[PDB]
């Protein structure tokens, strides 16, 4: 009955704590929020370059959580590597949207992925109908009761299928 959930890990971790810090607990807390309500189909995407700490230009906290969530079959790392000198990063967003679109679930993020909706009609509509935004207050993960405005549906039904 519950929609599959797909979380933009980077969006969430940046929002949580200092906005200039990749706060891995942000991801834990969001995940737990869905767990507590009964969800079991949950996926969080984060680039794999977040795993390696030898010189992190955006700082990170509680890095170990990523691999923790990987083991529980919740977090999935996204691909990236260095070509010649520089880092190249297969885009997060694509995995996030493609998965949610094809699993017919929801996307948890405050990014609206303007690039992607400019690429494909079907993705634009999906994003409009299926983005779930949120605010954090310290460690409280707070999504809106009215995810699509007063005209759309309640949180509870947004997260169901029928
Ligand atoms: Na943050």
CATH number at residue 150: 3.40.50.11980
CA of 60 to the centre of ligand 1 (A): 8
Q: Is 8 annotated as a binding residue?
A: no
In whole angstroms, what separates CA 78 from the centre of its chain? 12
Round to whole Å and give the CA distance between 126 and 100. Answer: 9
CA of 78 to the centre of ligand 1 (A): 19
Round to whole Å and give the CA distance between 90 and 9. Answer: 15
- Solved by what technique? X-ray
- Residue 32's SS3 state is helix
CB of 141 within 8 A of CB of 33? yes
Positive or negative torsion for Cα 150, 156, 158, 162: negative
Kindly provide the b/e burial profile for residues 13-42, where b requires at least 16 CB atoms within 10 angstroms of the residue's own CB: bbbbbeeeebbbebbbbbbebbeeeebeeb
CA of 51 to the centre of ligand 1 (A): 16
Round to whole Å and give the CA distance between 30 and 8. Answer: 10
Round to whole Å and give the CA distance between 5 and 7. Answer: 6
The DSSP symbol for 30 reads H
Give the number of domains in the chain: 1
CB of 148 within 8 A of CB of 162? no
Q: How many residues does the chain have?
A: 162
Residue 70: burial class (beta carbons within 10 Å; 0-12, 13-18, 19+): middle
Q: Which residues fall inside 5 Å of ion ligand 1, going by CB?
A: 14, 16-17, 21, 23
CB of 27 within 8 A of CB of 44? yes
Round to whole Å and give the CA distance between 59 and 74. Answer: 23
Round to whole Å and give the CA distance between 110 and 104. Answer: 19
Question: Can you give the resolution of this entry in Å?
Answer: 2.6
Q: Which residues contact 143 (CB under 8 A, 6 or more apart)?
A: 33, 108, 132, 133, 134, 135, 155
CB of 105 within 8 A of CB of 5? yes
Round to whole Å and give the CA distance between 141 and 34. Answer: 10
Residue range(s) defining the domain that contains residue 77: 1-162
Round to whole Å and give the CA distance between 1 and 19. Answer: 34
CB of 31 within 8 A of CB of 16? no
Positive or negative torsion for Cα 46, 93, 155, 13: positive
């Amino acid at each position: 009955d519950l929609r599959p959930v797909v979380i933009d890990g980077s969006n969430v971790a940046m929002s949580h704590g200092n906005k200039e810090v990749f706060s891995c607990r942000g991801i834990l807390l969001a995940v737990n929020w869905f767990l507590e309500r009964g969800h079991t189909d949950i996926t969080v995407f984060v680039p794999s370059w977040r795993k390696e700490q030898p010189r992190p230009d955006v700082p990170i906290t509680d890095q170990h959580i990523l691999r923790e969530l990987e083991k529980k079959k919740i977090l999935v790392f996204t691909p990236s590597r260095r070509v010649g000198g520089k880092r190249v990063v297969c885009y997060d967003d694509r995995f996030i949207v493609k998965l949610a679109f094809e699993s017919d679930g929801v996307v948890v993020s405050n990014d609206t992925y303007r690039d992607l909706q400019g690429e494909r009609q079907e993705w634009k509509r999906f994003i409009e109908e299926r983005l779930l935004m949120y605010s954090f207050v310290n460690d409280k993960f707070m999504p809106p009761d009215d995810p699509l405005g007063r005209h759309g549906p309640s949180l509870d039904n947004f997260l169901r299928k029928k």
